[PDB]
Ligand binder design. Sequence first.
Ligand SMILES: [Cl-]
Length: 625
Amino acid sequence: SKEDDTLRRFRYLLGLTDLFRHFIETNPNPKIREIMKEIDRQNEEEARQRKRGGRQGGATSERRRRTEAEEDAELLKDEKDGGSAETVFRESPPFIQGTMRDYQIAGLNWLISLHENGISGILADEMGLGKTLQTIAFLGYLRHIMGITGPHLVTVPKSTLDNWKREFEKWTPEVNVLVLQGAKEERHQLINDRLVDENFDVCITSYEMILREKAHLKKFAWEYIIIDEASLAQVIRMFNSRNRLLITGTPLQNNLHELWALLNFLLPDVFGDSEAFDQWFSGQDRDQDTVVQQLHRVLRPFLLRRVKSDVEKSLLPKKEINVYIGMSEMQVKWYQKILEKDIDAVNGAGGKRESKTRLLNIVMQLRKCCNHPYLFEGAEPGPPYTTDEHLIYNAGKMVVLDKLLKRIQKQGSRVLIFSQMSRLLDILEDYCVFRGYKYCRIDGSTAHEDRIAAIDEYNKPGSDKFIFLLTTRAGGLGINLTTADIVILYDSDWNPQADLQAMDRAHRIGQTKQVVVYRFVTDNAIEEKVLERAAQKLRLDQLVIQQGRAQVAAKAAANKDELLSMIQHGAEKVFQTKGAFGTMAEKGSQLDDDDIDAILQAGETRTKELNARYEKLGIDDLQKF
Ligand SMILES: [Cl-]
């Protein structure tokens, strides 16, 4: 759905300063204006039904905190869908017939992240970091996970044509590749049975053949158009594509026109014409070199670049630690109240015929309780609401957090704190002020939140900032927070890949320290159960990887080693034999049927034995073969 693509894209852009908002708000295209008006009026209504922060000791900031009802509806809706949809690979994917390096897996995950945010990107790794494999893995992700096979268009210099062809063939043989080359007669032989027929998943083309066949290429609604190393943009602009990838080996350059050309390539609906950009530049008040630098900063989320030294340096493994935590007396009371108000379902003695929605609501409330009792209306000590030390002691997690942060600051470390609930971050904001903690905050809002400003404030050398408060969703916005070295998951995502994505905001190339992750778990309550399920799904996930990779090898034609072991099997005993082999030498002619009844009996017995040998095994015992 391209209409939901636009929305997801626009919503992602609005946090990257007001630059994109401006080009959308004032966009020449009326249709573009409409969508922006829509998200605006929606943001207006949500602002009407929100307040700015009660607590007297509290945060003074201007964002508007959500209603208990409003966030309950979102958590519920989210629970109906098993959590975020995020995909994050922990290892080289089974569909890649080979092994990716750690930094290539990270590249893959970054490309995936762009795709799920509906944005195009630039892979600008230094030559030799295997950008081809990374791109191919990403297209493999589209195929095997998202059910998208193509059609994709890959345009390359003539010299690289053979390499792209081989790598597709090597890493993902199942992908149907069509290469456009040759004279005018060598083409029509391909076009009839292949090109015009859409008998391909991927079309690899030289820059040349793009022009000479543009008429046929324009007929397709392309998924991805990928340009390797970049009148090229003129023809590409006139192509239909859901997304694009630019593959280059060079960093961004201080050239205003090039930067506009990238923005136009990445966002052709937002930056459609050169004229609107020139008018924007002449109308604004920063000099050219400053604008150039602002454009670089804005292009950062759409660009991945790593140089050999980044890759050759070691990225320390993360220490992940679960923190098992009790509940305050107040938590105990509210937990009981929640369980009791639906005691029939909790006991589970009846029909269990109530809706799933009824059970989801319960789970949601228990989740809120394990977080902080103040999330419930009427729970916090009645008016006036103030940040006491009671704000800490009424929650088991707050008590542990409070001492943990104290110890984190002493050793001179900096911390990211993620949560599923914005209304919980609100409580954390107030707590931060009460302890005099300097902080930034990002929720992934489209209501005039500037995440570039906040990221930069946190990342500046000698920054005053200590804590960064973040929704777990914000972890999927491709942000870089390597200046922090400790991560606290205040509560967990039902999709472990979402939390992993969050940890990776700090645990990624550029990080110099050992990333320590603390996952708060309310012991002997609902959260510990979720924790076990998470570990089960992780093991299941590992098996399907381990097995799926063996399937690929099994499904495939024989190895030279496999062939050789076939040839050699029994070869000795054959060479040794001078007469006839065992069964034939025992007699020779058409002898006793008792020999036949024996052979059939021996055969039936050996058969049961050969089956039984493997029917019991699992893959690890199967690998011994
Ligand atoms: Cl490369």
